[PDB]
């Protein structure tokens, strides 16, 4: 479902993402937009030590399994969370086509 370009993009951007992602206020948006299902959301929040980074890392890995609209849907959640620079970077990259 999720194409290689988006999967590759999430891989090459691994560090920027796990360094910058703010997940605290994302939970409800990921649920509200149906990007992830309620059980996966809790799996992500409980990832590793449950640290912001571990949660952020598990989130972006699981993202590969959410279909073709996983990335643009993810970008929408980032924006409604106010994470504009991160959303901007991702958009510019996918739009660079």
């Amino acid at each position: 479902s999720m194409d290689e370009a988006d999967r590759r993009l999430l891989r090459r951007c691994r560090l920027r993402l796990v360094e910058e992602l703010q997940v605290d206020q994302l939970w409800d948006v990921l649920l509200s937009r149906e990007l992830f299902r309620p059980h996966m959301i809790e799996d992500i929040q409980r990832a590793g030590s449950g640290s912001r980074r571990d949660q952020a890392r598990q989130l972006i890995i699981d993202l590969e399994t959410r279909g073709s609209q996983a990335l643009p849907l993810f970008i929408s959640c980032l924006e409604d969370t106010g994470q504009d620079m991160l959303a901007s970077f991702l958009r510019t990259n996918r739009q660079a086509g």
Partner: protein, 95 residues
């Protein structure tokens, strides 16, 4: 990878396994494109960090020269200075 590279890894793989934490290093190697998600989960799935380190190293050993430098840069970038020092012998390019 190079003989000296592969051997430098083997020569210090024990000291490495006894100290390194894989998650941050895999973030780097994933970004560099020298580690896959599946490979990453196999390593993460290991019961103890010594086995995770062991699995990572096990994987890197069958990889190209660039992966040796990716792992070396990651170690430095992550504070494993002394262990990166020990691996300097094996090929280190970049930093």
């Amino acid at each position: 990878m190079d003989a000296k590279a592969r051997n430098c890894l083997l020569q210090h793989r024990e000291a490495l396994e006894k100290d390194i934490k894989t998650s941050y290093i895999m973030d780097h190697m994933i970004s560099d494109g020298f580690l896959t998600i599946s490979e990453e989960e196999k390593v993460r799935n290991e019961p103890t960090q010594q086995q995770r380190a062991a699995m990572l190293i096990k994987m890197i050993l069958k990889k190209d020269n660039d992966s040796y430098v990716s792992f070396y840069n990651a170690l430095l970038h992550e504070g494993y200075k002394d262990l990166a020092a020990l691996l300097h012998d094996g090929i280190p390019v970049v930093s």
